[PDB]
C-alpha cells in the first residue's frame, strides 16, 4: 500500500510538471511543496511501612504473574492432562475395559477447552492457591524450569565445559552449537542419546584413570606438572584431582530429567561406498535446514548487544593485567567478526550466516582451548575474564543459531530506537549517538552493503537529516 | 629476576586516561564530518556555478587593474548573493 | 571545487537510475572502516607494546659474609665470587 | 516535522524495495527543501 501511494504521487508530480544523473538529483523547484489539496509521628511511620509492604507484595506478585505468563502454555497443558489422568485412572484401576468411552465421557484436538469438572481437582487447586507468600513463587519458578528443561540442559553443558576445559569436556558443546541447535525445533532423539552415553562414558573413564597406580600419578609428576596446561592427562581431562567430577553428575541428572519429561509428553572401492554412505546424510541435513517453511524473526539487536558486552569484557581483562598479547588479537578479530555479521544481516543470506557461524564456532573453540593455553596459562586455573568472555560468546552463538533456524524477515532497515517517539526512546537514541564511532561505522557500512545510487556524502546528508528530525 | 626500570606509570588510571582522552578527541573530530553536514547544504548543492565563478574572476581582474570603485561594487553584489538563499537558487539555476 | 566536480560529472555521465559501482563502494568503504578501526585499536597496541618488559635473571656475582663481635674486629670474613657460587641444576632444584 | 519525517521514511522504504529512480527523485526533493529556508517555513507550518 505504501509503495502504490508513493508511485501515484510521483506520477501526479510528473503530470503536473508536464503542464544526467546529477541533473535528476539537482532537479527541484517550488511547485513540489505546494499544498496538493492538503497532501503524630506514629501514623506517618505506619503509613510508610504499609506503603513499603504493599509495594513489596505488589512487586513479588507481579513477578509471579509474569513468570506464570511464561509458563502459560505448559500450565494449561498440564491442567488438561492431569484432569484426563484422574478421569482415566478410575476405570483403569477397577478393570480397564474401553478407550473411546472413557476419553469421550467429558473437535478432536483443541488447544483450550472446557468440559465437566471434578471436585477433587479444584479442591486441590484453591488449596494450593490459598498459600502465596513464598510457596506460590517457588512453585512458579520450578514450573518455569520444568517447562524450559532444554535450555537448562544446554546451560549445564556449557557451564561444565567452562570448568575443566579439556577435549573430552569440549566435544559436547561443539555438538550443541553445530548439531543440537540446528536440526528442527525438537532436536533429534539421537542427539539426546549421544549426550547421555557420552557423559556416562566420560564419568566412568575419569573414575578409572583417577586411580593412583597409573604412572602419570606418582605425587612427583603431579606436583611438578601442577599448573602446566599441556600435561597430557589435563588436556584429555583424565588428570586426577580431589574434585575429579565438576558439574558432571548435575549434567547427567539434567539430561535424564529432560528425557523423562519429553517421554511423558511427546514423541521419542570401499572408500567410495563409505563416503557415499556418510556424506549424503550430511548433505540431506544441510539441505533440509536451508529450505523449509518457518516463522521469521529478527534478533540482530541482541546479537550485537552481546558482542558489545564481549568487547567490554575484553577491555576489562586488559585493564586487569602474556595474556594481553592474546587479548589484543581477540579484540581485533572481534571487530572483524562484528563487521562481517553486520554485512550478513544487511544482505539477508541465510547460507552465508550458516557458514560464518560454523566457521566461527570451530575457530573460537580451537583457539580458546588449545592455542591460548599454549601461549599463556591454564584457561580455567585463572582468567575468570576468559571464562566470562566465553560464556557471553556462547550466548551469541545461541542467538545466531536461533536466527538461522527462524530465518530473516522482510523489512529489516530502520533503527530499532525510532519505532516509538517516547521519552525513553529519545534518551536511548541520544545515548547511542553519544558513544564514539558508532554512528560513523553504522552509516558507512549501511552505505556499503545497501545498494543505492547516492554517493557517500549524499547518504551522510540523508542520515543526518533523519536523525535531527527524529 | 630483574628488568630495566622502564615501569614509569602503569595502567589502572595511570595512562588509561590519556587513551580515553585521545579516543574521545578523535571521535569528536571525526563526528565533525558527520554531525551538522546538512546545515551547509545551501552552499554546496549548486547545479551551475558559472555566474558566481565569473563574478569572482571579475573581482580579481578589476582588483588587478587598479579601478577600486568597481571592486567595491562587485564585492557588494557578491555579499548580497551570499546573503539571500532564494536569490542564490535563482542565480545558480541550470541554464537553458 | 564545485566547478571541478560539475565538469567531471559532465565528462562521464551516469545512466539514469543505477546501482553504484561495487568496486568503488568496496574500496572507499573498506578504506574508511579500516581507518576508523585502526584509530580505535592501535593505541592499545602501542600501550601494550611499550610495557613489554622481560625479566632478566640477575645472579649474585659475589657474596660476602662477616662475623663481628661487639665493635672490636670482624672475627671472620669470607667472600666467594666465581667458582664458589654454584647455580642450581634442575636435578638439585628437584631435590629441594 | 511530520512531512519531513514521512519523506525520510519514504526514502528508506523505496531504497529497501529496490526502485532506485524514486529514491533519486525523493532525495532531490529533500535536498531542495533544505536548500530554501522559506519553503521550509511553508512546509513545517503547524497544520490546521
Ligand atoms: C574419552 C573418549 C571417549 C570416547 C567415547 C566415544 C563415544 C561416542 C558416542 C557415544 C555413544 C554412542 C551413542 C549413540 C546412540 C545412537 C543410537 C541410540 O539412539 O539408540 C538408543 C539405545 O542406546 C542403547 O540403549 C545404549 C547404547 C550404549 C552404547 C555404549 C557405547 C560405549 C562406547 C564406549 C567407548 C569407550 C572408549 C574408551 C576410549 C579410551 C535408543 O534408546 P531408546 O530405545 O530411546 O531407549 C529406551 C530405553 N528403554 C528401553 C528402557 C525404554
Ligand atoms: C529464585 C529463587 C531460588 C530457587 C530457584 C530454583 C531452584 C531449583 C533447585 C533445584 C530443583 C530440583 C528439582 C528436582 C525435580 C525432580 C524431577 C524428577 O522427580 O522427575 C522424575 C525423575 O526424573 C529423572 O530422575 C531425572 C533425574 C532427576 C533427579 C532429581 C532428584 C531430586 C530428588 C528430590 C528429593 C526430595 C526428597 C524430599 C524428602 C523426601 C521423573 O519425572 P516424574 O516424577 O515421574 O513426573 C514428571 C512430571 N511432573 C514433575 C510434573 C510430575
Ligand atoms: C581422549 C579424547 C577422546 C575424545 C572422543 C570424542 C569422540 C567424538 C565423536 C563425534 C561423532 C559425531 C557424530 C555425529 C552423528 C550425527 C548422526 C547423523 O544422523 O546426523 C545427521 C547429520 O549430522 C550432522 O551433520 C552432524 C554435524 C557435526 C559437525 C561437527 C564438526 C566438528 C569439527 C571438529 C574439527 C576439529 C579439528 C581439531 C584439529 C584438527 C542428522 O541426523 P538426525 O537429524 O539426528 O536424524 C536421525 C534419525 N533419523 C535418521 C531416523 C531421521
Ligand atoms: C558483566 C556483564 C554481563 C552481562 C550479561 C548480559 C549479556 C546480554 C546478551 C543479550 C541477551 C539476549 C537474551 C535473548 C532472549 C531470547 C529471546 C528469544 O527470541 O529467543 C528464544 C530462543 O533463542 C535462544 O534460545 C535464546 C539464547 C539463550 C539466552 C540465554 C541468556 C541467559 C540470560 C541470563 C539472565 C540472568 C539474569 C540475572 C538477573 C539478576 C526464542 O524463544 P524460545 O526459547 O526458542 O521458545 C519460545 C518460548 N516462549 C515463547 C515462551 C518464550
Ligand atoms: C581490520 C580488521 C578487518 C580486516 C578486514 C577483514 C574483515 C572484512 C569483513 C567484511 C565483510 C565480509 C562479508 C562477506 C560476505 C557476506 C555477505 C555475502 O552475501 O557477500 C556476497 C559476496 O560478496 C562479494 O564476495 C564481495 C566481497 C565480499 C568480501 C569483501 C572483501 C572486501 C573487504 C571488505 C571488508 C573490509 C573490512 C575492513 C576492516 C578494517 C554477496 O553476494 P549476495 O548477493 O549476498 O549473494 C547471496 C548468496 N546466497 C544466495 C547464498 C545468499
Ligand atoms: C591503518 C591503515 C589504513 C590505511 C592507510 C591510511 C589511509 C588514509 C586514511 C583514510 C583516508 C580516507 C579518505 C576519504 C576520502 C573522501 C573523498 C570524498 O570525496 O568522498 C566523499 C565522502 O567523504 C566523506 O567526507 C567521508 C567523511 C569522513 C572523512 C574523515 C575520515 C578520514 C580522515 C582521513 C585522514 C587521513 C590522514 C592521513 C595522514 C597521513 C564521497 O565522494 P564524493 O565527494 O561524493 O565524489 C564527488 C565526485 N567525484 C567522484 C568525481 C569526485
Ligand atoms: C570501554 C568502553 C567502550 C565503549 C563502550 C560503550 C558501551 C555502551 C553499552 C551499550 C551500547 C549499546 C547500543 C548500541 C547497539 C546498537 C544495536 C543495533 O541495533 O546494532 C546495529 C549495529 O550498528 C552497526 O551496524 C554499526 C556497528 C557495528 C560495527 C562495529 C564496529 C566496531 C565496534 C566499535 C565499538 C566501539 C569502539 C570504542 C568503544 C565505544 C563503543 C563500544 C545498529 O542498529 P541497526 O542494525 O540499524 O538496527 C537494526 C534493528 N533491526
From Swiss-Prot, chain B:
> What name goes with this protein?
Piezo-type mechanosensitive ion channel component 1
Q: Where in the cell is it found?
A: Endoplasmic reticulum membrane; Endoplasmic reticulum-Golgi intermediate compartment membrane; Cell membrane; Cell projection, Lamellipodium membrane
Q: In which tissues is it expressed?
A: Expressed in bladder, colon, kidney and skin. Also expressed in bone marrow, liver, lung, spleen and erythrocytes (at protein level). Expressed in myoblasts (at protein level). Expressed in red blood cells. Expressed in cochlear inner and outer hair cells (IHCs and OHCs) and vestibular organ HCs.
Additional observations: Piezo comes from the Greek 'piesi' meaning pressure.
Similarity comment: Belongs to the PIEZO (TC 1.A.75) family.
Q: Which residues of the full protein are shown?
A: 2452 to 2547 of 2547
Cytoplasmic face: residue ranges? 28-96
Which stretches are transmembrane? 7-27
According to its UniProt entry, the function of this protein is described as: Pore-forming subunit of the mechanosensitive non-specific cation Piezo channel required for rapidly adapting mechanically activated (MA) currents and has a key role in sensing touch and tactile pain. Piezo channels are homotrimeric three-blade propeller-shaped structures that utilize a cap-motion and plug-and-latch mechanism to gate their ion-conducting pathways. Generates currents characterized by a linear current-voltage relationship that are sensitive to ruthenium red and gadolinium. Conductance to monovalent alkali ions is highest for K(+), intermediate for Na(+) and lowest for Li(+).
- Quaternary structure and interacting proteins, as annotated: Homotrimer; the homotrimer forms a propeller-shaped Piezo channel with a cation-ion conducting pore. Heterotrimeric interaction may occur between PIEZO1 and PIEZO2. Interacts with PKD2. Interacts with STOMl3. Interacts with TMC1, TMC2, PCDG15 and CIB2; the interaction may be part of the MET complex. Interacts with MDFIC (via C-terminus); the interaction prolongs Piezo channel inactivation. Interacts with MDFI (via C-terminus); the interaction prolongs Piezo channel inactivation.
Q: Could you say what a knockout of this gene produces?
A: Embryo lethality at midgestation with defects in vascular remodeling. Conditional knockout mice in inner ear hair cells show no auditory and vestibular defects.
* Source species: Mus musculus
Q: Which gene encodes it?
A: Piezo1
UniProtKB/Swiss-Prot annotation, chain C:
- Mutant lacking the gene: phenotype: Embryo lethality at midgestation with defects in vascular remodeling. Conditional knockout mice in inner ear hair cells show no auditory and vestibular defects.
Signal peptide (UniProt feature, chain positions): none
**Which stretches are transmembrane?**
30-50
The subcellular location is: Endoplasmic reticulum membrane; Endoplasmic reticulum-Golgi intermediate compartment membrane; Cell membrane; Cell projection, Lamellipodium membrane
Which tissues express it? Expressed in bladder, colon, kidney and skin. Also expressed in bone marrow, liver, lung, spleen and erythrocytes (at protein level). Expressed in myoblasts (at protein level). Expressed in red blood cells. Expressed in cochlear inner and outer hair cells (IHCs and OHCs) and vestibular organ HCs.
Complex formation: Homotrimer; the homotrimer forms a propeller-shaped Piezo channel with a cation-ion conducting pore. Heterotrimeric interaction may occur between PIEZO1 and PIEZO2. Interacts with PKD2. Interacts with STOMl3. Interacts with TMC1, TMC2, PCDG15 and CIB2; the interaction may be part of the MET complex. Interacts with MDFIC (via C-terminus); the interaction prolongs Piezo channel inactivation. Interacts with MDFI (via C-terminus); the interaction prolongs Piezo channel inactivation.
Protein family (similarity comment): Belongs to the PIEZO (TC 1.A.75) family.
Q: What else is known?
A: Piezo comes from the Greek 'piesi' meaning pressure.
Q: Describe its function.
A: Pore-forming subunit of the mechanosensitive non-specific cation Piezo channel required for rapidly adapting mechanically activated (MA) currents and has a key role in sensing touch and tactile pain. Piezo channels are homotrimeric three-blade propeller-shaped structures that utilize a cap-motion and plug-and-latch mechanism to gate their ion-conducting pathways. Generates currents characterized by a linear current-voltage relationship that are sensitive to ruthenium red and gadolinium. Conductance to monovalent alkali ions is highest for K(+), intermediate for Na(+) and lowest for Li(+).
Q: What is this protein called?
A: Piezo-type mechanosensitive ion channel component 1
| This protein's encoding gene | Piezo1
Amino acid at each position: 500500500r505504501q509503495m502504490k501511494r508513493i508511485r501515484a504521487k510521483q506520477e501526479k508530480y510528473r503530470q503536473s510538471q508536464a503542464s544526467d544523473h546529477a541533473t535528476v538529483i539537482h532537479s527541484g523547484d517550488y511547485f513540489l511543496f505546494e499544498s496538493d489539496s492538503e497532501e503524630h509521628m506514629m501514623q506517618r511511620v505506619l503509613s510508610t511501612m504499609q506503603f513499603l509492604w504493599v509495594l513489596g507484595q505488589a512487586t513479588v506478585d507481579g513477578l509471579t504473574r509474569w513468570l506464570r505468563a511464561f509458563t502459560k502454555h505448559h500450565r494449561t497443558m498440564s491442567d488438561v492432562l492431569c484432569a484426563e489422568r484422574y478421569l482415566l485412572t478410575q476405570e483403569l484401576l477397577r478393570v480397564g475395559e474401553v478407550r473411546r468411552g472413557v476419553l469421550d465421557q467429558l473437535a478432536s484436538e483443541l488447544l483450550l477447552d472446557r468440559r465437566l469438572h471434578i471436585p477433587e481437582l479444584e479442591e486441590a487447586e484453591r488449596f494450593e492457591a490459598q498459600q502465596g507468600r513464598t510457596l506460590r513463587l517457588l512453585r512458579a519458578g520450578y514450573q518455569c524450569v520444568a517447562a524450559h528443561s532444554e535450555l537448562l540442559c544446554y546451560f549445564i553443558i556449557i557451564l561444565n565445559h567452562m570448568v575443566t576445559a579439556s577435549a573430552a569436556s569440549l566435544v559436547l558443546p561443539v555438538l550443541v552449537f553445530l548439531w543440537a541447535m540446528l536440526t528442527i525445533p525438537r532436536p533429534s532423539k539421537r542427539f539426546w542419546m549421544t549426550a547421555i552415553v557420552f557423559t556416562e562414558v566420560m564419568v566412568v573413564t575419569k573414575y578409572l584413570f583417577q586411580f593412583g597406580f597409573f604412572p602419570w600419578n606418582s605425587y612427583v609428576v603431579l606436583r611438578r606438572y601442577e599448573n602446566k596446561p599441556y600435561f597430557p592427562p589435563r588436556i584429555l581431562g583424565l588428570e586426577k584431582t580431589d574434585s575429579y567430577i565438576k558439574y558432571d553428575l548435575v549434567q547427567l541428572m539434567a539430561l535424564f530429567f529432560h528425557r523423562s519429561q519429553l517421554l511423558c509428553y511427546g514423541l521419542w572401492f570401499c572408500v567410495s561406498l563409505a563416503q557415499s554412505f556418510y556424506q549424503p546424510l550430511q548433505r540431506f541435513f544441510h539441505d533440509i535446514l536451508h529450505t523449509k517453511y518457518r516463522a521469521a524473526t529478527d534478533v540482530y539487536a541482541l546479537m550485537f548487544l552481546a558482542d558489545i558486552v564481549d568487547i567490554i569484557i575484553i577491555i576489562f581483562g586488559f585493564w586487569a593485567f602474556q595474556v594481553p598479547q592474546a587479548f589484543l588479537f581477540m579484540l581485533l578479530v572481534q571487530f572483524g567478526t562484528m563487521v562481517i555479521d553486520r554485512a550478513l544481516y544487511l544482505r539477508k543470506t541465510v547460507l552465508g550466516k550458516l557458514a560464518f557461524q560454523v566457521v566461527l564456532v570451530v575457530a573460537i573453540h580451537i583457539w580458546m582451548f588449545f592455542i591460548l593455553p599454549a601461549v599463556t596459562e591454564r584457561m580455567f586455573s585463572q582468567n575468570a575474564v576468559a571464562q566470562l568472555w566465553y560464556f557471553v560468546k556462547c550466548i551469541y552463538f545461541a542467538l545466531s543459531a536461533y536466527q538461522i533456524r527462524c530465518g530473516y524477515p522482510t523489512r529489516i532497515l530502520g533503527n530499532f530506537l525510532t519505532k516509538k517517539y517516547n521519552h525513553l526512546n529519545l534518551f536511548l537514541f541520544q545515548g547511542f549517538r553519544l558513544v564514539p564511532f558508532l554512528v560513523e561505522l553504522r552509516a558507512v557500512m549501511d552505505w556499503v552493503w545497501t545498494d543505492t545510487t547516492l554517493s557517500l556524502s549524499n547518504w551522510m546528508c540523508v542520515e543526518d537529516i533523519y536523525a535531527n528530525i527524529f | 629476576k630483574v628488568s630495566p626500570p622502564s615501569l614509569g606509570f602503569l595502567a589502572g588510571y595511570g595512562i588509561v586516561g590519556l587513551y580515553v582522552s585521545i579516543v574521545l578527541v578523535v571521535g569528536k573530530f571525526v563526528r565533525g564530518f558527520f554531525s551538522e553536514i546538512s546545515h551547509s547544504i545551501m552552499f554546496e548543492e549548486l547545479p551551475c556555478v558559472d555566474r558566481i565563478l565569473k563574478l569572482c574572476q571579475d573581482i580579481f581582474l578589476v582588483r588587478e587593474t587598479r579601478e577600486l570603485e568597481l571592486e567595491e561594487e562587485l564585492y557588494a553584489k557578491l555579499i548580497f548573493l551570499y546573503r539571500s538563499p532564494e536569490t542564490m537558487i535563482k542565480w545558480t539555476r541550470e541554464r537553458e | 571545487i564545485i566547478k571541478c566536480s560539475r565538469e567531471t560529472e559532465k565528462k562521464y555521465p551516469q545512466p539514469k537510475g543505477q546501482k553504484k559501482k561495487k568496486i568503488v563502494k568496496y574500496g572507499m568503504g573498506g578504506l574508511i572502516i579500516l581507518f576508523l578501526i585502526a584509530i580505535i585499536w592501535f593505541p592499545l597496541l602501542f600501550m601494550s607494546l611499550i610495557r613489554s618488559v622481560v625479566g632478566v635473571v640477575n645472579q649474585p656475582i659475589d657474596v660476602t659474609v662477616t662475623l663481628k663481635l661487639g665493635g672490636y674486629e670482624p672475627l671472620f670474613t669470607m667472600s666467594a665470587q666465581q667458582p664458589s657460587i654454584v647455580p642450581f641444576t634442575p636435578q638439585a632444584y628437584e631435590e629441594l
